[PDB]
């Protein structure tokens, strides 16, 4: 019913593993980029 | 440039301006002022610079005269080194809508006086060079950036 089956789950594996590294290291980069706002103070300095 | 400064060098004293604060000018004191001169205004701290018509020997003549003062101590003969400003890549941003124009000044760290690059760094400020609306040059001036401008 499925040929593929074992060539289908040695994929998998391999999706995986990639999958792990990938998000992880685009976690990085996305927090890196932020930082510059995540960290961001900012006041009001009316002439009051 | 205060901003710049303010930012550039946070943190450290570089980072102030050289009026000071409100704060500081409501409240110091006679003493203060006083010890300012007397822990700063010393002699190897300080140059008699002339240019014109002298004679120098006439001129370190005078010095010698009212430039009194001998120190006794090696304390009083130590030019004190000061602790190194950290630099730091950042951004103020004062923002008035309500202002004609904006200003915006943006920088790198420069050496600082003894080092041979800041020739070259001179040169190739020269490059770029400046510009202002009343530059009859216009459209023609060698600056890149100017021409653009
Ligand atoms: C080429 O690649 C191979 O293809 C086979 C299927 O054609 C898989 O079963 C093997 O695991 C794979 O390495
Ligand atoms: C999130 C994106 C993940 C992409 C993972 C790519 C891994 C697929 O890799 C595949 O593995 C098979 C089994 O060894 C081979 O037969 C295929 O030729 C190969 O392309």
Known sequence: ?48 | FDYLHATAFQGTALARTVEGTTENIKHLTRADLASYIDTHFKAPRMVLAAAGGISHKELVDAARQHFSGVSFTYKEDAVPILPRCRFTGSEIRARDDALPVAHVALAVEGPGWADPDNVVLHVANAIIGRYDRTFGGGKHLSSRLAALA
Do not use: C, F, N
């Open chain 1, 1 to 48: 019913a499925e040929p593929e089956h074992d060539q289908r789950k040695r994929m998998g594996l391999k999706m995986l593993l990639i999958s792990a590294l990938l998000t992880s290291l685009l976690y990085y980069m996305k927090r890196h980029k932020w930082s510059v706002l995540k960290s961001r103070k900012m006041a009001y300095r009316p002439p009051k």
